[PDB]
Design a protein around this ligand. Structure first.
Ligand SMILES: *[C@@H]1O[C@H](CO)[C@@H](O)[C@H](O)[C@H]1NC(C)=O
Ligand SMILES: [Cl-]
Ligand SMILES: [Cu+2]
Ligand SMILES: [Cu+2]
Ligand SMILES: [Mg+2]
Ligand SMILES: [O]
Ligand SMILES: [O]
Lengths: 325, 325
């Protein structure tokens, strides 16, 4: 319940995340703790814990050892159910005990996500430093070749340090700027910005995220402008913009893999967008784009009942970030 | 267009003017070759380009969706009661030909210091036609003399496939030949109107050399220059009043609508000088003299030709135009 103990608890919870916990205290908690045993530890008197326990007891949660994507609606909903519990804990023993309990029940990708945003958005997390995700889930930051050498080092029980090279070949001019988007710290900057300012945030979680929609515009504007500065530094032209009715010129082979789920897929050069089953038609993206530009060129956003919300004012850019993200 | 009269250029933009530039720049759309603007980017030159007419038919069809949205005119809409067009005839054959026209190129060349001009002219072949006179016999049974608007159009009878066109299929293809206001006395009388006096056309411009001579002669000798004999430069050239037609001759419908001049010029002065080009170029420094929609009475759908045939103040007759090569 002090910062040293909280930091150690988090360190332990995130250690060797693909395996059952090796810490005797956390194993005991995962075995014996009942998230519904004392609802006085929650600000919602157990409402969020009841929702998550029902999903768990009905065998409706994603299995362990499976890929996780925050953009997958149902998997995100499951991670946010655990976030919701952690976010309701009044004191650290509630936060730690629920984390230990659900670590052993829930998918590891969902758990890591929920624990990180739980620490970030709870006052109980104040003073904790989250370990870098590239050491908690290295597969998401390390190409498959190096992971295999790590797998080989483990299979052979020999220590080693292995050099990571950038993806692609020298024939690929885009490799000239791979040090930007592949930098592990740039990746942590990006994930952490979205953890700090999540698109799923609702103020019923406890507070408002000030100017979030405008900061969404700004942080990505700066990523784009910074990338273009690297291109300029490497005798490359600025990036083109995507358009739904034109080819995506530059393909990509990540040469990276999930821990569970297989290799990340590749995209060939010069492809037209295809409709994605279960997601959207390309035409839907064009219509959505058109509707956003209609608001911009009207000078107002149209509310659900048809009334106008003026955006010809300083908060207009923020409201646009709200509707665009 | 758009013009500065647009109530909302932020939203509606400038379709027509931007289209001129889009078309004009298609020989170098990205500026890679440093070519200057195309002929579509100057009103001096735009009609030289065939695509001018494809662009403007496209725009014309936008307007036509609006004009087609109104209810067809009824008998009561169109009838000028007590006014009957008994006969429409032309005094003189309708004949076109090409003749020659000269203009000076001196301003295009470079003159030295102390270098005498030499005369340098271009000679162009231009369409022209012979003079003719409309003879429109009208019976006024109202009981008193009445101001009438005479609206004269030339309409195709068949298309290039030899298919006879309905009035509805003709009306949007008709070209305006004249519009004028004239008192029609009680009884039966033949109105005469010279082709030379069309309110759609203006004569060839006086040459720069002629303007210099006349101005210089007037200034030298204290002679009041008065050029009130010339017209504006806005207006179809008189020489192009008629379509070229064919050496074998073609037949067209000459369409005459005689409408209530009092109603048409209410709020103005019907029997006053409207200049020589008011049909499409208006009146310099004055309100537009005709209150009717431009194109009246052909600008609305005519699904039922019986409506027009039942109106005594509308008549069309067949005329033949012959080209002399
Ligand atoms: C890896 O890189 C280090 C320094 O960056 C270098 O000393 C070593 O030779 C490299 N190893 C291999 C196998 O190339
Ligand atoms: Cl007479
Ligand atoms: Cu982002
Ligand atoms: Cu135009
Ligand atoms: Mg599956
Ligand atoms: O035009
Ligand atoms: O135009």
């Amino acid at each position: 319940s002090s910062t040293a103990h909280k930091q150690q608890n988090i360190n332990h919870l995130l250690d060797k995340i693909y395996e059952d916990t090796k810490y005797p205290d956390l194993q005991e908690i995962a075995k014996n703790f009942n998230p519904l045993g004392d609802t006085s530890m929650y600000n919602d008197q157990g409402a969020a814990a009841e929702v998550l326990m029902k999903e768990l007891n009905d065998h409706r949660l994603l299995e362990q050892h499976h890929w996780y994507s925050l953009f997958n609606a149902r998997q995100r909903e499951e991670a946010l159910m655990l976030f919701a519990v952690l976010n309701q804990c009044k004191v650290w023993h509630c936060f730690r005990n629920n984390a230990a309990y659900f670590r052993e029940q829930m998918n590891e990708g969902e758990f890591v996500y929920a624990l990180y945003v739980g620490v970030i958005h709870s006052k109980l997390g104040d003073g904790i430093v989250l370990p870098p995700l590239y050491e908690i889930t290295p597969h998401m930051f390390t190409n498959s070749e190096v992971i295999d050498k790590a797998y080989s080092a483990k299979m052979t029980q020999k220590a080693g340090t292995f050099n990571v090279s950038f993806t692609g070949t020298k024939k690929n001019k885009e490799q000239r700027v791979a040090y930007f988007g592949e930098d592990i710290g740039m990746n942590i900057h990006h994930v952490t910005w979205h953890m700090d300012f999540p698109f799923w945030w609702q103020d019923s979680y406890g507070n408002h995220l000030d100017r979030k929609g405008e900061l969404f515009f700004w942080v990505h504007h700066q990523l784009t402008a910074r990338f273009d500065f690297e291109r300029l530094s490497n005798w490359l032209d600025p990036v083109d913009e995507l358009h739904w009715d034109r080819i995506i010129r530059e393909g990509f082979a990540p040469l990276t893999s999930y821990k569970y789920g297989g290799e990340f897929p590749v995209r060939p050069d010069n492809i037209h967008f295809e409709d994605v089953d279960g997601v959207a038609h390309v035409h839907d993206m064009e219509i959505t784009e058109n509707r956003i530009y209609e608001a911009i060129d009207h000078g107002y956003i149209t509310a659900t009942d048809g009334h106008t919300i003026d955006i010809r004012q300083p908060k207009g850019i923020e409201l646009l970030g709200d509707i665009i993200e | 267009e758009s013009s500065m009269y647009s109530p909302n250029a932020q939203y509606y933009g400038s379709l027509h003017n931007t289209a001129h530039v889009m078309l004009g720049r298609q020989g170098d759309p990205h500026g890679k070759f440093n070519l200057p603007p195309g002929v579509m980017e100057h009103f001096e030159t735009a009609t030289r380009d065939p695509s001018f007419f494809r662009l403007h038919k496209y725009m014309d069809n936008i307007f036509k969706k609006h004009t087609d949205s109104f209810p067809p005119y009824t008998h009561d809409d169109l009838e000028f009661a007590g006014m009957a067009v008994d006969g429409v005839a032309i005094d003189g054959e309708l004949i076109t030909f090409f003749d020659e026209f000269q203009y000076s190129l001196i301003n295009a060349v470079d003159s030295g210091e102390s270098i005498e001009d030499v005369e340098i002219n271009a000679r162009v072949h231009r369409l022209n036609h012979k003079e003719f006179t409309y003879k429109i016999t009208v019976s006024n049974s109202i009981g008193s003399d009445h101001l009438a608007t005479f609206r004269i159009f030339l309409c195709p009878i068949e298309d290039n496939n030899g298919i006879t066109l309905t009035l509805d299929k003709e009306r949007w293809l008709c070209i305006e030949l004249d519009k004028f206001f004239q008192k029609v006395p009680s009884g039966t009388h033949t109105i005469h109107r010279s082709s030379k006096d069309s309110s759609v056309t203006v004569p060839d411009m006086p040459s720069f050399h002629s303007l210099k001579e006349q101005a210089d002669n007037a200034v030298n000798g204290g002679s009041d220059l008065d050029l009130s004999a010339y017209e504006r430069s806005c207006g179809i050239p008189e020489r192009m009043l008629l379509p070229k037609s064919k050496p074998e001759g073609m037949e067209f419908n000459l369409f005459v609508a005689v409408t209530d001049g009092d109603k048409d010029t209410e709020g103005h002065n019907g029997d006053h000088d409207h200049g020589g080009t008011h049909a499409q170029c208006g009146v310099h420094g004055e309100a537009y003299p005709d209150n009717r929609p431009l194109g009246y009475p052909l600008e609305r759908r005519i699904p039922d030709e019986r409506v027009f045939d039942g109106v005594p103040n509308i008549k069309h007759v067949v005329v033949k135009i012959v080209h002399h090569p």
